[PDB]
Design a protein around this nucleic acid. Structure first.
Ligand SMILES: Nc1ncnc2c1ncn2[C@@H]1O[C@H](COP(=O)(O)OP(=O)(O)OP(=O)(O)O)[C@@H](O)[C@H]1O
Ligand SMILES: [Ca+2]
Ligand SMILES: [Ca+2]
Ligand SMILES: [Ca+2]
Ligand SMILES: [Ca+2]
Ligand SMILES: [Ca+2]
Length: 903
DNA sequence: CATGTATGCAGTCCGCG
DNA sequence: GCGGACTGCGTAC
């Protein structure tokens, strides 16, 4: 097999590399790496090395990495560019793996772990590690085993061995419901003292050294706690055995009352699953507890136990260990669904970076571009210092706030990357400039053609048409991957709807789910077989289709994020290729493109409808247009349609056969106007939206920029079995909006869009009458706890203190002296509730860590003093008032002359 | 060490015979 | 008490 790296580190003048050899064996080596850097040289000097602007360079070969870094400083002092890759491990990887990396994940040791620590005096601080580690579960991907380390004897209590028999039993039978599919994979190791537990864990660690280290909050809790606990008991060099190269770095971040630390373990790649989740999931959660996320991702119930966690080991050691095991497994389950570890490996090896550098799009792109240029013996430019400077972004149309009955939307495929490729925007493709006219002159096609030789953007930049740029070249490669995966995702989505349609008429029979590849549209023969399947088989197939869709979403959305990230990086001062000429060439082109095509669509639709001067495009944002299709439907007459699907079909066909070609002609003309390298402005239909035929539904509404709702029947070619709401920006989509309020607001929207005003009014009345009966957590607001200390003036709110921070301070006073109540952690999220005047907390609101019940001591008072009136008004009524006034209808029946009568 | 800008709403402060 | 500056937060791209 071809060799591939596992980890790489620079330690002084050595590169330390863990890798897989040609036989598939894990090996480690130390290499006294001799790096090269480059200096500009005279033309008369023959060389095979050129910088990106074709200027000759001489190679400087250094005897070591320190000599290389010292030369960099001398060059800076002299005032001359020091060219080449200054991150030497990237150079090392590029030299060592001078080919496309094909990696085998089954050879990569991925470790998932979690520890337990009983603490009778508050949260167990990792930097202090003053309490015994009393459980570790460590899952090893190569063994496929859960190694469980259980402390029987502790100063906080002596307990009996954990029982796997009881663990496997249902909870309803007093067991723990440890999932049956992992029971046989548990290797249980009880210990009579912590020292033996820890020494054995380290010995185990040495035999099975993680390459990828993950788990839930491992970076901020488990890793630093294990490190510091070992340090305190055995000494720092024992703790260093956690690094295969015996080198660590301690980062002491100043939390101020108290403090915490992050440990860097050289030769391990730590990918804390919480960080993977936040970067790759594109959700924004009100809570990041593992229980909350697991419930959200997997629909498994919260792990229940009685009393505080500090008393769980002594009262119920059986459950304590089981829950430690299950927590480790839950992360694996989330990953089996989301596939973020796979994504990370994919991207890391593609870029040739340390795997943990997938968190940094700038590092990822620096590596990709470096490797690409190095292949052509080209020499990368030195990174330079730049002041931060704001620059212009996208255009967003101001919508007239209203209900909009029929709407069709269109947007550009991968807009900014497509612009990069169309215009050929790269650091080395800049050809010069032209004199800009006002943007509106380009939009209206009245400005002078910028160039008839070069490819242009209305920001004034010109690029070579007849040569490749590394940015376009490399961005295209990742786009093409993105496109492949999005294809798989949409096919799985379409396939899911076929199964949903078939579930209407299930067969009474005993059968099997069909062995199909969900990444591809079902053939007619498969469709026929599906129409004869039972409910059971259909539901399993639907589960599989949706898992395939999710896997496709992960793969495509994060490749989309990476290429969009390159466009953004050009405007980040730390990017080697930072250049506001290139950043604004993209955004200014996007502004022109949107407004150009708005003009063209208004022109086309006026012509085909036989009118003049009517505004068809009601809204747009960055690269999208929203077309009111009322006149299209009215031209044929609503009466002609058999059902909703009939008009949906009609608009679908109208968009594809009439509008899209007109849009394409419009953009081709724009491409010719800017004399661009390649026409790539592909604006495909997104949504077809409207009310159900014959209903009083309003179809859709806008309240303003970035705030709207649509009743969608077809999305990017997926014809839904049931209409689906597309809601953007409204409170239903915000993690700060109480959960039960998101639900009620969405139902209010659904009723508005599908049923009409009377239906809405009926629901509002019910919700207002039942509001006070909702669980307090379901109606609490959510906020992020930032700069708490800033506004903390002797436990009381300072000036300009935000509402949620005031809530936190109220909480800190209420829990004072009590050692057992959970602390609000800086940066994390809190539930927030308003409080009626005269309450025993002495302020207008209270806040507590999200995803939890509020501590028992004050729960009763909070419940008694919650201000329901304020809560209903602020979270529910006020937003609903915004929706309804925009849509020109009422959530409460207005008084009228008819009130004089008895109906 | 190191993706971007555009943008609405809820909050505090402050003015207001 | 209401509404205009000014800003934090969360979101749409
Ligand atoms: N997270 C982001 N970072 C930087 N720029 C972004 C981001 N999201 C959107 N943009 C910019 O807005 C443009 C349009 O966004 P949009 O969500 O339509 O995605 P897209 O790249 O056009 O891909 P798609 O083909 O899915 O529409 C992007 O091309 C860019
Ligand atoms: Ca735990
Ligand atoms: Ca788009
Ligand atoms: Ca059937
Ligand atoms: Ca878009
Ligand atoms: Ca599309």
């Amino acid at each position: 097999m071809k060799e591939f790296y596992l980890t790489v580190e620079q330690i002084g003048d050595s590169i330390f590399e863990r890798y897989i050899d040609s036989n598939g064996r894990e090996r480690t080596r130390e290499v006294e790496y001799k790096p090269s850097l480059f200096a500009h040289c005279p033309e008369s000097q023959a060389t095979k090395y050129f910088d990106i602007y074709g200027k000759p360079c001489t190679r400087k070969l250094f005897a070591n990495m320190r000599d290389a870094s010292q030369w960099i400083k001398r060059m800076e002092d002299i005032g001359l560019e020091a060219l080449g890759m200054d991150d030497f491990k990237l150079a090392y990887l590029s030299d060592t793996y001078n080919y496309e990396i094909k990696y085998d994940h089954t050879k990569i040791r991925v470790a998932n772990f979690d520890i337990e620590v009983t603490s009778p005096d508050g949260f167990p601080e990792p930097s202090q590690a003053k309490h015994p580690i009393d459980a570790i579960t460590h899952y090893d991907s190569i063994d496929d085993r859960f190694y469980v380390f259980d402390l029987l004897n502790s100063p906080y209590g002596n307990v009996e061995e954990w029982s796997i028999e009881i663990a496997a039993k249902l909870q309803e039978q007093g067991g723990d419901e440890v999932p049956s599919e992992i029971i046989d994979k548990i290797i249980y190791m009880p210990f009579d003292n912590e020292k033996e537990l820890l020494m054995e864990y380290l010995n185990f660690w040495q035999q099975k050294t993680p390459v990828i280290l993950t788990g839930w909050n491992v970076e901020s809790f488990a890793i630093p706690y294990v490190y510091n606990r070992i340090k305190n008991i055995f000494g720092e060099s024992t703790a260093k055995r956690l690094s295969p190269h015996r080198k660590t770095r301690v980062k002491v971040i100043e939390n101020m009352y108290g403090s915490r630390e992050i440990i860097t373990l050289f030769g391990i790649s730590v990918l804390d699953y919480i960080d993977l989740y936040k970067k790759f999931s594109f959700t924004n959660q009100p809570s990041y507890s593992l229980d909350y996320i697991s419930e959200f991702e997997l629909n498994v119930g919260k792990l229940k136990y009685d009393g505080p966690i500090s008393k769980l080991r002594e009262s119920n050691h059986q459950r304590y260990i089981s829950y430690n095991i299950i927590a480790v497994y839950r992360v694996l389950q989330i990953d089996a669904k989301r596939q973020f570890i796979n994504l990370s490996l994919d991207m890391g090896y593609y870029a040739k970076i340390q795997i943990q550098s997938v968190f940094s799009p700038i590092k990822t792109w620096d590596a990709i571009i470096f490797n690409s240029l190095k292949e052509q013996n080209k020499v990368i430019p030195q990174g330079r210092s730049h002041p931060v400077q704001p620059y212009p972004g996208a255009f967003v149309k101001e919508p007239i706030p209203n209900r909009y009955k029929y709407v069709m939307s269109f947007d550009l495929t991968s807009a900014y990357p497509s612009i990069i490729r169309q215009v050929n925007i790269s650091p080395e493709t800049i050809a010069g400039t032209f004199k800009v006219a006002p943007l509106h002159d380009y939009i209206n096609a009245v400005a002078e053609r910028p160039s008839d030789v070069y490819s242009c953007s209305p920001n004034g930049m010109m690029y070579y048409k007849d040569r490749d740029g590394v940015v376009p070249t490399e961005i295209t490669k990742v786009f093409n991957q993105r496109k492949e995966h999005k294809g798989y995702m949409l096919a799985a989505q379409r396939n899911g709807e076929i199964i949903k349609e078939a579930l209407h008429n299930p067969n009474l029979s005993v059968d099997e789910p069909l062995d199909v590849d969900y990444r591809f549209d079902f053939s007619d023969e498969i469709k026929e077989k599906i129409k004869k399947l039972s409910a059971k088989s259909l539901n399993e197939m639907l589960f599989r289709a949706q898992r395939t869709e999710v896997a496709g979403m992960t793969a495509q959305i994060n490749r989309k994020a990476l290429i969009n990230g390159l466009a953004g990086a050009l405007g980040n001062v730390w990017f080697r290729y930072y250049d506001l000429r290139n950043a604004t060439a993209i955004t200014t082109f996007g502004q022109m493109a949107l407004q150009w095509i708005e003009r063209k669509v208004n022109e086309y639709l006026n012509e085909v409808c036989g009118t003049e001067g009517e505004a068809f495009v009601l809204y747009g944002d960055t690269d999208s247009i929203y077309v009111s299709a009322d006149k299209i439907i009215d031209k044929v007459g609503e009466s002609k349609f058999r059902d909703t699907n009939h008009w949906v079909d009609f608009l679908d066909k109208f968009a594809r056969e009439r509008m899209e070609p007109a849009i394409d002609r419009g953009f081709r003309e724009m491409c010719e106007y800017m004399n661009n390298k390649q026409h790539l402005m592909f604006m495909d239909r997104e949504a077809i939206a409207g009310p159900p035929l014959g209903s009083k539904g309003i179809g859709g509404f806008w309240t303003g920029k970035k705030r709207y709702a649509l009743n969608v029947w077809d999305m990017e070619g997926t014809r839904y079995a049931e209409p689906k709401l597309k809601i953007m920006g409204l409170e239903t989509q915000k993690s700060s909006t109480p959960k039960a309020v998101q639900k009620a607001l969405k139902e209010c929207i659904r009723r508005m869009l599908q049923e009409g005003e009377e239906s809405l009014q009926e629901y509002f009345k019910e919700f207002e009458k039942e509001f006070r009966q909702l669980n307090y957590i379901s109606i609490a607001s959510v906020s992020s706890a930032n700069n708490i200390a800033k506004y903390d003036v002797g436990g009381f709110p300072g000036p300009k203190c935000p509402f949620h921070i005031r809530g936190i301070l109220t909480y800190n006073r209420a829990i004072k002296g009590n050692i057992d109540a959970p602390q609000v952690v800086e940066g994390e999220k809190v539930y927030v509730l308003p409080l009626r005047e005269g309450n025993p907390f002495g302020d207008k609101c209270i806040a507590w860590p999200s995803g939890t019940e509020i501590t028992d001591l004050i729960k009763d008072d909070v419940l008694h003093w919650m201000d329901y009136t304020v809560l209903l008004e602020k979270t529910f009524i006020k937003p609903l008032e915004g929706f309804t006034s925009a849509a020109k209808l009422d959530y409460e029946k207005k008084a009228s002359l008819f009130d004089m009568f008895d109906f």
